[PDB]
């Protein structure tokens, strides 16, 4: 239930070695407005795949 | 009875020996009684072997 010897900072780093986040590989460029956005998601202006899907 | 196995065993052996001796003694008494009962008459005048 509890430890008998204090784990090292080395062991702590070894355990945390897989806890790293993964950056997005590449963003997509909208074909009309030219801005970047996450793949399969609408752009920050409200466009998606050229057409303006949501007003503002 | 006792905490010691050796004493318990000794007591058990003594009781067992007494029980066997009692059983043999009782069997002898029962046989002796039966034989005596058959040989002796009822005590009435009818049961006779000599007059």
């Amino acid at each position: 239930a509890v430890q008998q010897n204090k784990p090292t900072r080395s062991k702590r780093g070894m355990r945390r070695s897989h806890d790293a986040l993964t950056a997005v590989t590449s963003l997509s460029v909208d074909k009309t407005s030219g801005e970047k956005h996450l793949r399969h998601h609408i752009t920050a202006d409200g466009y998606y795949r050229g057409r303006k899907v949501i007003a503002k | 009875d006792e905490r010691s196995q050796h004493k318990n065993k000794a007591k058990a052996l003594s009781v067992l020996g007494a029980r066997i001796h009692a059983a043999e003694m009782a069997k002898r008494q029962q046989a002796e009684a039966s034989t005596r009962r058959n040989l002796l008459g009822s005590g009435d005048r009818s049961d006779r072997n000599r007059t």
């Binding site: 399969h40 998601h41 998606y48 899907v53 949501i54 | -």
Partner: protein
């Protein structure tokens, strides 16, 4: 295991799910575009598209059935007078999901769901 099963539980009991989907379907056909989380949006289709399909043919029985599944007479009236003739030729797929990022408060993947011919 849940082999060949369908339907997201969404960490709610069945009555809550039924009521929530009824409310969400009413809201969607009222406003023509609504924003909700991606699994709830994907599950909302299976309730709002049969209602429109039912609404395609105007009849007293169909209206009572739509009323039983929505409990909002204004919603039923709109469905049968507008959404039925508008989608009278479509072979299903009267909605469209557009993934719209992540919610600020709880990082839930949000989406907009709208009728295909909204404009």
């Amino acid at each position: 295991m849940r082999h060949r099963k369908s339907g997201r539980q969404l960490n709610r009991n069945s009555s809550h799910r039924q009521a929530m989907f009824r409310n969400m379907a009413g809201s969607l056909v009222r406003h023509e575009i609504i924003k909700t989380t991606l699994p709830k949006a994907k599950e909302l289709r299976r309730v709002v598209e049969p209602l429109i399909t039912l609404a395609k043919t105007d009849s007293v029985a169909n209206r009572r059935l739509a009323f039983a599944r929505t409990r909002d007479n204004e919603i039923v009236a709109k469905l049968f007078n507008e959404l039925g003739p508008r989608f009278a030729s479509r072979a299903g797929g009267y909605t469209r999901i557009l993934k719209c990022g992540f919610r600020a408060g709880d990082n839930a993947p949000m989406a907009y769901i709208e009728l295909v011919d909204r404009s």
